[PDB]
Amino acid sequence: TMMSVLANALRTIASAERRGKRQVLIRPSSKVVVKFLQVMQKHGYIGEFEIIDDHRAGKIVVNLNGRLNKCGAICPRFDCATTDYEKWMKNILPSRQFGFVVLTTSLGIMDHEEARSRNTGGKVLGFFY
Amino acid sequence: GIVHSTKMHRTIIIRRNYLHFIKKYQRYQKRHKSLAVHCSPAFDPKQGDEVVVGQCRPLSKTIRYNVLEVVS
Amino acid sequence: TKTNGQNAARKLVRLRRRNRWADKGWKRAHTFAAKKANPFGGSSHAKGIVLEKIGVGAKQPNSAIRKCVRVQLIKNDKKIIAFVPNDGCLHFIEENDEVLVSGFGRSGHAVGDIPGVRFKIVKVSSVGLYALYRQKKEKPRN
Amino acid sequence: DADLSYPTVRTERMKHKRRRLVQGPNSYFMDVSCPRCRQVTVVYSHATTAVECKGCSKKLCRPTGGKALLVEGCGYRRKPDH
Amino acid sequence: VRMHGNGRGKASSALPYRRTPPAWLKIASRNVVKMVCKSSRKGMMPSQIGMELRDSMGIAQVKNVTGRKILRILKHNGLAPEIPEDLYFLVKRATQMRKHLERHTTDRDTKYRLILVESRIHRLARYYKRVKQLPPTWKYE
RNA sequence: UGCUGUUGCUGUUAAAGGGUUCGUAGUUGAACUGUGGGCUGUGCAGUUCCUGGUCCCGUCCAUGUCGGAUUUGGUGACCCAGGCCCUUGCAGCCCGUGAACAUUCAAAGAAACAAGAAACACGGGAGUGGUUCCUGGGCGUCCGUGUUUUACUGUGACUAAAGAAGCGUGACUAAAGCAGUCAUUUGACUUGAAUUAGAAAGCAUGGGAUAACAAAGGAGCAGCCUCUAGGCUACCGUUUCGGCUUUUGUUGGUUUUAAAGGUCUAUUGGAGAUUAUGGAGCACGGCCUCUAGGAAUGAAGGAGGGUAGUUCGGGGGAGAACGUACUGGGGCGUCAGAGGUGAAAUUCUUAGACCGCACCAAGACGAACUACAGCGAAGGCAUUCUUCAAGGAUACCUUCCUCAAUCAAGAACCAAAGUGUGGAGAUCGAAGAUGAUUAGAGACCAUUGUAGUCCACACUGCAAACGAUGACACCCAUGAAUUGGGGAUCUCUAUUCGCACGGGAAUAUCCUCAGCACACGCGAAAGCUUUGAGGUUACAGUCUCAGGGGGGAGUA
């Protein structure tokens, strides 16, 4: 019973970053798991993927460069109006400098900083410091 | 709304389903309201059909609405 | 553990209504069971008549005889053993004197070393009791 | 030393078929030739059924649980995958 | 995990990535489609039809040769069974256990294994009505 | 007061996981339809040509096997390099694309066409548009004829003052107030009195990632378009006579012709997402035939189902037996004690106990093998043979295609003792009796003994029902083991046994799935660990149950 396929995905990345692994192999890839990872990769927290075809649901193989402290998923996916970036910045991120909160917006999966500038709000997905 | 039950003569009960938002817990809730709605014999809705429903003057005791359209 | 979901807000609202009753500082605020039994009936002070002067042997390792009074509340007709707060002040109280009674200050329970005494006298015949003890006013003769 | 995305021969020869990176089959078709008549029938590795020659009906294999036993020196030829 | 009872065991066919039929199959689609139906007129189910093809006749997957699964092939020819076969083999177990328990009324183990099997039937019969593949008045008895 | 916990608690031992399983309302629910391109200038990263600083080749030695050097060495290897728009990717910018593919090319994609489009095309109105708008085409208006919402988010409308936030302002300051300030008089400031928030719901309109609703369930279907010619043909309406399109000057009446549509035949051009010159039947061919059928995402280290080893097991029901033992009874012998205890005594004995052989009768029970073993949802389950339905695990390129997870209410099962009616009654044995012990002692000990213990059919549902640890899912290192099933050896290949339940059985090496068990991190500590109490203030995978100082009390 895989309820959220990000929950399973970003834990593995999280809990295999805490062990210093060079690579992680993630069980059910999905359109959201990729778009989330490609945001991690934009800011330098992950090296590379392989998305392997099983013909059913892929298997992502991520190269870790050692720079992730944590990866969450926020499970119920609460909303954000663009005025609510300050709650999430405040509660879930360590400092007001270096964290990132990842959202789904009309425009897509993007950072809370890519969202403030485009003015969309959306639903929260997770974070990474 | 959906057509809940047809058993009245020339009238019908629609249930209108909605989610209600409780602030403290930041989550939703199933709720519903049911209406007495008059169906002109032009229409023949069956249980389960979405229906468009208009405002009327009070007709029976509980009937303020009237079936405009049957969507199926 | 608890239940989590966007649409789950019944379970959460219900689950708190049920689990607050397990709370006591308020299993107190919600029971008339509290009000019927507080001989003041909810009010901060009350006036009684002095029925009887009473020594109460102090509790546990402390030895003393604490100077207490029975009281007949004028509201409720209930009877209350109240404490006379200071030196010799039981001399300012006579039987059948009207007396204003207050709590000890742990709301419904006795202040340690007087067994089961929840109330103390603040006034005797409309003159304050500490204002008589400390000498300020003279007890009106009537 | 190892990549997860390109594993060595020795690691993945060991794994369960479902635990492979791929999910492959463990089975293959053999090309079987009946001893009693010279005739050739394709036979599935794990048969799970009585399999008979077409001309003569010989019961060319046993159902046995894991991997079917071919009968009495009948010639097997293993077919390709593709 | 498992529907009723606790096993976690995992054993399944693992279908290949490569879906083109082998080179050594010289059997035309219409010759497969006719085998299916020919052997379904012998009163067979699909879950077996597909065996006699991979066992003896060497057709691994009928979708991969014939364009289509073993039931569209039957549903198109009107040979499709009246009750889905996952539902037929449960009713068939439940009834034998009902016949078992009719002599043996102290056998508690199979009185509990019914309670499971019947509760399945009512879940499938709830699926196959919702999905419209059973008549909405279908009932156990 | 994170002691009510959505943010945000706790539940092995502190208070707290229901005894187990099924299961409705409810909550939660897997993947997929989807990197748009090319051109220019400019920032990044990964084959022309030039190096000779390497290893390889070779030479000289030959050195028994750990020297070496040797030049050209050698398009070999290699390298550090270049404003090569030859490279590819990539950042940023300009800008073009009917822009995948196909299709058109006329004055600049016009027309047809492809795609989209109801915010649309298709016909129509002068009582449309400030006197019928613009330059044969085009907008505006109205009507007739022929398919998407919602949450969420952005913006915007719509909303009493006081109150709260806020701008301005020296009421002497301040709590306030909405005032005042300035010339210089016989007014000036266009005098100020801004602005914001204000659950939910309702309104309009952008966005379309994540989600929800509805529909589907795949043979439960399904339209090829187009030029022209001909033929026939009212059109609606019905209860009886009803309706009817302009033009002919107008109205009433009649009637024709004509288009329209329909329908029948005729072939003009082109399609087609599934081969008709094809399949089928009687290597080529006819003949005769019968004539739609293949266009569907996938098959989840999710669920259900199938078949196989006549696989695995103290799993469950039934029927026959079997085994020694406790007790009892005769038979057969013997003669004085036996039993029981710390020591005795109550109890049994010349009317023959104890003891010893062989049996017979009855009821229970399944020792040793028996384990940190197996099976079962838990409770529980141990002789053999037959027998009846099942159950898991494994094997598989079978089948199916979301059917699922957890669960108020509800249902079934639940050890021992109990309870009801019949049976049984060997052993043990609540109550009871007796002897000891003791200051006392029905107690603990001993000889007894009723209910009971056993069985069938009904109830009860009250355990330290324990792992004091809810269920489903994921991640997680090590060593030797173990029970099922499977695979390889027939770099590991090897041992022992030899028609008949047997091309067999067990073992060895290695792998693998599934079961019970004997580094991180966490924890108040004890300790837990791929069988979690770990991956949690860096707090969020899902459902549910219970706890909130000790008593009173699981009482009234």
D in contact with E (at least 3 C-beta pairs within 8 A): yes
**Six token digits for residue C68:** 């207490």
Note which residues in 53-82 of chain A have CB less than 8 A from chain E. 53-55
Q: Is the CB of B25 under 7 A from strand F?
A: yes
Which sign, positive or negative, has the C-alpha torsion D33, D44, E64, E132? positive
The answer to whether the CB of D30 falls within 8 A of the CB of E55 is no
Nearest to B36 by CA among B69, B14, B52, B16: B14
Ordered by start, the domain boundaries in chain A are: 1-68, 69-129
Q: Which nucleotide is nearest to D64 (CA to C1')?
A: F309
Which residues of chain A neighbour C6 with C-beta distances below 8 Å?
76-77
Angle in degrees, CA C84, C86, C87, rounded to 5: 120
Which of E41, E103, E115, E37 lies closest to E71 in space, CA to CA?
A: E37
- With CA atoms as reference, report the closest residue to E18 among D25, C92, D71: D25
Give E91 CA → F300 C1' in Å.
27
Q: How far apart are CA B6 and CA B12, in angstroms?
A: 5
Per-residue three-class SS string for chain A = CCCCHHHHHHHHHHHHHCCCCCEEEECCCCHHHHHHHHHHHHCCCCCECCEECCCCCCEEEEECCCCCCCECCCCCCCEECCCCHHHHHHHHCCCCCCCEEEEEECCCEEEHHHHHHHCCCEEEEEEEC
Q: How far apart are CA C81 and CA C104, in angstroms?
A: 12
C25 is written with which tokens?
């500082």
Residues in chain B with CB shorter than 8 Å from the CB of C13 are 22, 25
Residues 1-60 of E with CB under 7 A from strand F: 1-16, 18-19, 22, 28-30, 33, 45-51, 54, 60
- State the best of A13, A61, A62, A64 to mutate against chain D, taking most chain D CBs within 10 Å: A61
The Cα–Cα gap between C91 and C133 comes to: 10
Q: What is the dihedral of CA A85, A86, A91, A92, to 10 degrees?
A: 30
Q: Taking a C-beta distance cutoff of 8 angstroms, is the pair C86, C130 a contact? A: yes
Tokens matching residue D59 = 């019961």
Does the nearest atom of strand F lie within 7 Å of A51's Cβ? no
Supply A58's token pair.
Answer: 């892929």
Domain that holds residue C97: 1-141
Q: Does domain A1-68 have CATH number 3.40.440.10?
A: no
Residue whose C-alpha is closest to residue E91's, from E81, E76, E106: E81
**DSSP helix/strand/coil, C70:** strand
Q: Are A75 and A7 in contact (CB under 8 A)?
A: yes
- E55–D81: do the CB atoms touch at under 8 Å? no
Between chains, do C6 and A75 touch, taking CB under 8 Å as contact? no
Residue of B nearest to C16 (CA): B25
Residue B22 C-alpha from the chain's centroid: 24
| CA–C1' gap, A63 and F40, in angstroms | 37
CA nearest neighbour of A88 among A117, A118, A121, A119: A121
Q: By C-alpha distance, which of B32, B43, B42 is closest to B2?
A: B32
Instruction: Determine whether the interchain pair A54/D23 forms a contact, defined as Cβ–Cβ distance below 8 Å.
Output: yes
Cβ separation D5–A52 shorter than 8 A? yes
Strand F: which of residues 33-72 in chain B lie with Cβ below 7 A? 48, 50
D12-19 contacts, C-beta under 8 A, 24 or more apart? D17/E14, D18/E10, D18/E12, D18/E14
Query: Which among C128, C90, C83, C87 has a CA at the least distance from the CA of C110?
Result: C83
Residue E55 Cα, gap to closest chain D Cα (Å)? 5
- Count of structural domains within chain C: 1
Equal fold, A1-68 vs A69-129: no
- DSSP 8-state symbol, C109: S
Are B48 and B3 in contact by the 8 Å Cβ rule? The answer is yes
CA-nearest residue of chain C to B27? C6
Residues of D in contact with A56 (CB under 8 A): 23
HEC secondary structure over chain D: CCCCCCCCHHHHCCCCCCCCCCCCCCCCEEEEECCCCCCEEEEECCCCCCECCCCCCCCCEECCCCCCEECCCCEEEECCCC
Going by C-beta distance under 8 Å and a sequence separation of 6 or more, which residues neighbour residue A13? A24, A26, A46, A62, A64, A68, A71
Indicate yes or no: strand F within 7 A of the C-beta of E98: no
Amino acid (one-letter) located at A111:
D
User: With contact defined as beta carbons under 8 Å apart, do C131 and C92 qualify?
Assistant: no
Q: Please tell me if residue D1 touches chain A, with a CB cutoff of 8 Å.
A: no
Alpha-carbon gap, residue B18 to E32, rounded angstroms: 52
Q: Does domain A69-129 have CATH number 3.40.50.720?
A: no
Nucleotides in F strand less than 7 A from protein CB: 3-11, 17, 21-24, 26-34, 151-155, 199-201, 206-211, 214-215, 217-220, 279-280, 293-296, 298-311, 315-318, 376-379, 388-406, 412-414, 456-458, 470-476, 485-488, 503-504, 510-515, 520, 534-536, 538-549
CA distance D6 to B23: 51
Angstroms from B22 CA to nearest CA on chain C: 7
Asked if E22's CB is within 8 angstroms of D80's CB, the reply is yes
D79, E24 in Cβ contact below 8 A? Answer: yes
- Is A77–C6 a contact, with Cβ atoms under 8 angstroms apart? yes
Q: Side-chain half-sphere of E14: how many Cα atoms within 13 Å?
A: 15
Query: Could you tell me if B22 and B29 are in contact, meaning their C-beta atoms sit under 8 angstroms apart?
Result: yes
Q: What's the rounded Cα separation, in Å, for the pair E89 and E126? A: 16
